[PDB]
Write a protein that binds this ligand. Sequence first.
Ligand code: PAP
Ligand code: ZN
Ligand code: ZN
Ligand code: ZN
Ligand code: ZN
Lengths: 289, 294
Amino acid sequence: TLWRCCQRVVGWVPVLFITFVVVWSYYAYVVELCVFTIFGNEENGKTVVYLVAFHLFFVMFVWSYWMTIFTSPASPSKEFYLSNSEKERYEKEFSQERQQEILRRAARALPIYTTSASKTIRYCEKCQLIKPDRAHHCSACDSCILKMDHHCPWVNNCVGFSNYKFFLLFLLYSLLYCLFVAATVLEYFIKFWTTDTRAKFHVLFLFFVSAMFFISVLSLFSYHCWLVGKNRTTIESFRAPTFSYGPDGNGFSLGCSKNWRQVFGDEKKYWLLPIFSSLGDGCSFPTRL
Amino acid sequence: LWRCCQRVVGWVPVLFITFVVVWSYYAYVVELCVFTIFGNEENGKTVVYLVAFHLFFVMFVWSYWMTIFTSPASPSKEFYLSNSEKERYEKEFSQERQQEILRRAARALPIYTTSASKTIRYCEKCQLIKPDRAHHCSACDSCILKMDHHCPWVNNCVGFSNYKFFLLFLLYSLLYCLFVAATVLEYFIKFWTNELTDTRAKFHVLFLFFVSAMFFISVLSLFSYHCWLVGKNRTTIESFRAPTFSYGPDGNGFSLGCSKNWRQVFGDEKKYWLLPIFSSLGDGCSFPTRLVGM
Ligand SMILES: Nc1ncnc2c1ncn2[C@@H]1O[C@H](COP(=O)(O)OP(=O)(O)O)[C@@H](OP(=O)(O)O)[C@H]1O
Ligand SMILES: [Zn+2]
Ligand SMILES: [Zn+2]
Ligand SMILES: [Zn+2]
Ligand SMILES: [Zn+2]
């Protein structure tokens, strides 16, 4: 009955956890490292430079992170749904052959260039719609997601056509945020090991939390730089889409340069900003052939 | 009672300045940096301007806030007439013996200055003996240590506690306005000669340059005056009426040399010089004299 409320709340636990670490990291770097440690030293130039630079990375990180969480994933348009007449004929029908004929007649009026592994029309039983190309159903979001990449638990949201560029920038600014911390706390991490009671706990934690997050998230970032240039989602990287000419891992590829511009766009000024600049509408995609 | 009315109406200059500063933040960030500069298609200057602007905007609002809410220092309870001395002072009818009551108390205090008539500097309202450089302000309704002047733009007195914050407030005001004027100028040129014609951005970019230039030219004169007062170790009051010591009036009676005079306000630790954090030497109730006696 009330299982929805607890299920919905527990989904925010990874978000609140990450949010706490970021708030703690701000307190640790600004107060403990810059004010108590670096400003505990008589160097006002080094303290200000770090504080200014830190706020630039911290803003780009929180901005990208926020956008990846609250950008709702796009769903298929009204045209892909079975009308109340045709969905009755589909539910009334018992022969799979005639079921496929119902779906094929509506789908041929839609920009669909892919089929299932069994060359059947990609259809969603729960949503009662014909899945657009690259779209998949997520049982966590309980919906079909356009150009679905994966349901990322750390943002309590699906990473799809709307989220993807924000998700990528979130990864990018995560490495930069953590690398900058590790590179600047290192000079003082060496000193802390080789004596303030409170400052050491936060500075010691600061260096290897930033390092652990760097070495971990860096693997994912290199993974997606492959994916963007190949024009493949994570789902497609495990199951290549099947076109009219058979399976093709490169069926949506337009070349390395043009594949990136499908995600980041043609406006060069928006590439590094968590502002939506992805080409297309998510319900149809340019084909290689 | 109009003292209640004074408290509310006193915030009008503060709220007015707050409006101009909030408006300046919106105008420079949204209208100038987002609509105008980022429309020109290169985010290299936009990030630099947005980063630099936030450095000056923070130091300006920080200094302004500190000058407003730093309560002015008052004389210690030793400078107040005790319940014994207030009686015999009130009983006396001869002014000559009244001074002797104040003189006997003043000689137990680190006081090296008198009035122009060589009488003990005494406050009738607070019923205390004014410390050196301290003055009574009827707006604050109190005696202010090393009082410089009552400032309406901060709804507060600029005294011993405020002065370095007030100075930083002036400094970061000039820098904030100079940075705005120097960066908006190139785009101020465009709007008049119609290289840019946006309706909303024009009002804010034009007003940004005028208001920043008008505030710069005005505050710069005041700032240079106070840079000279600090080197002379003189409050604004003292620069018009030199204090009277045991050896007569002396405009330089509190001077300790140019270097040491600045250190009285900003301190010896350079890391606090530019920061709105209290670093002034002394206690405000006594000050080193040039000749002898502290
Ligand atoms: N109620 C007040 N409001 C504003 N300023 C005051 C007030 N009372 C004294 N002052 C300041 O102190 C001076 C007034 O006379 P006093 O030297 O006796 O000071 P005081 O009575 O406050 O201790 C004024 O400065 P000026 O004569 O050199 O122009 C004034 O700035
Ligand atoms: Zn679905
Ligand atoms: Zn999902
Ligand atoms: Zn008084
Ligand atoms: Zn006052």
